Amino acid sequence: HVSVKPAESAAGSWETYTMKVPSEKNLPTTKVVLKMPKDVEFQQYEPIPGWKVSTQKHDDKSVSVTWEATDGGIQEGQFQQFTFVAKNPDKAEEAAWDAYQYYKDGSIVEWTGDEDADTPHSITNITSA
């Protein structure tokens, strides 16, 4: 399950987020794509050995960040944490973190479901007062 923490954060602020990506298969995780939640503006990423990081704007105005393994990826029995900075929206909202976990066999696990789904996205509660 991919998580982006903190699970609560203040509206309007520049938050340092940490995405944790555990292995869930006995195969390497070679790439992770994270969609920015609505109204959350990506600012910067923290470099990490063994990964190249890039951002993608899209035809719809959403933005994604991609971490691609340049070494062995995340192996069985491992997890990795990836840190970045984003600006929170101005109003209270539930920010969903749609993540796509790529494995070496070409499979993609889509951490995009709601509460009851098999692969839910994690959420940050953007609050105020």
Residue numbers in the entry: 27 to 155
Sentences from the paper on this structure:
The fold of the apo structure of BsYcnIΔC is very similar to that of the Cu-bound protein with an RMSD of 0.59 Å over 127 Cα. The primary differences are in the N-terminal region near the Cu-binding site. Instead of the His27 and Glu50 side chains turning in toward one another as they do in the Cu-bound form, in the apo form, these residues are oriented away from one another with the N terminus directly hydrogen bonding to the side chain of Glu50. In one of the two chains of the asymmetric unit, we observe two alternate conformations for His27, suggesting that this side chain displays a degree of flexibility. In our apo structure, we also observe a malonate molecule from the cryoprotectant solution near the N terminus, indicating that this region of the protein is solvent accessible.
The ycn operon comprises genes encoding three proteins: the putative copper importer YcnJ, the copper-dependent transcriptional repressor YcnK, and the uncharacterized Domain of Unknown Function 1775 (DUF1775) containing YcnI. The B. subtilis YcnI protein contains a predicted signal sequence N-terminal to the DUF1775 domain, suggesting that endogenously, the DUF1775 domain is localized extracellularly and tethered to the membrane by the C-terminal transmembrane helix. We crystallized both the apo and copper-bound forms of the protein and determined their structures to a resolution of 2.05 and 2.11 Å, respectively. Overall, BsYcnIΔC adopts a cupredoxin fold featuring the characteristic Greek key β barrel shared among many bacterial copper-binding proteins.
